[PDB]
From a paper:
One [name]–DNAAC crystal diffracted to 0.95 Å, which is thus far the highest resolution for any TF–DNA complex. The high resolution revealed alternative conformations for most of the phosphates, sugars and bases of the DNA backbone, hitherto only observed in two previous TF–DNA complexes. We first assessed whether differences in resolution would affect the detection of the water molecules using the two [name]–DNAAC structures solved at 0.95 Å and 1.3 Å. Analysis of the highest-affinity complex, [name]–DNAAC, revealed that the high-affinity binding of BARHL to DNAAC is caused by a combination of indirect and direct recognition of DNA. Key amino acids involved in the recognition of the AC dinucleotide and its complementary bases are Asn282 and two threonines: Thr278 and Thr285. Thr278 is connected to DNA by two water chains. The first water chain contains three water molecules that together connect the side-chain oxygen of Thr278 with the side-chain oxygen of Asn282 and N7 of the A of the AC dinucleotide (A7). On the other side, Thr278 is connected to N4 of the C of AC (C8) by a second chain of four water molecules.
Transcription factors (TFs) recognize specific bases within their DNA-binding motifs, with each base contributing nearly independently to total binding energy. Here we solved high-resolution (<1 Å) structures of MYF5 and [name] bound to DNAs containing sets of dinucleotides that have different affinities to the proteins. The dinucleotides were recognized either enthalpically, by an extensive water network that connects the adjacent bases to the TF, or entropically, by a hydrophobic patch that maintained interfacial water mobility.
Residue numbers in the entry: 228 to 293
DNA sequence: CGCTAAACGGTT
DNA sequence: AACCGTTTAGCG
């Protein structure tokens, strides 16, 4: 067990995942404002959205490479 | 296991 | 500060 507390793993709802994915198809990168807006719309934290987008870009790149 | 959320150390 | 590349880990 890590010495430093980690954050609990967020479980996204179906609506949140749908909306995150619709954002991603439109824009692969968000401005600060568009990110902080999407977080508010989905009742997520700014960092949860930032992280989701970052990890989603990793997945996107993996799949561009096949 | 596999998908992926969060963590690490480095990079822009 | 946001990102990258990659790792590490939660959990269905």
């Amino acid at each position: 067990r890590a010495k430093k507390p980690r954050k609990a793993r967020t479980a996204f709802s179906d609506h949140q995942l749908n909306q995150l994915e619709r954002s991603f198809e439109r824009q692969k990168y968000l401005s600060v404002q568009d990110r902080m807006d999407l977080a508010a719309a989905l009742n997520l934290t700014d960092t949860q959205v930032k992280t989701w987008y970052q990890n989603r870009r990793t997945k996107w790149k993996r799949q561009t490479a096949v």
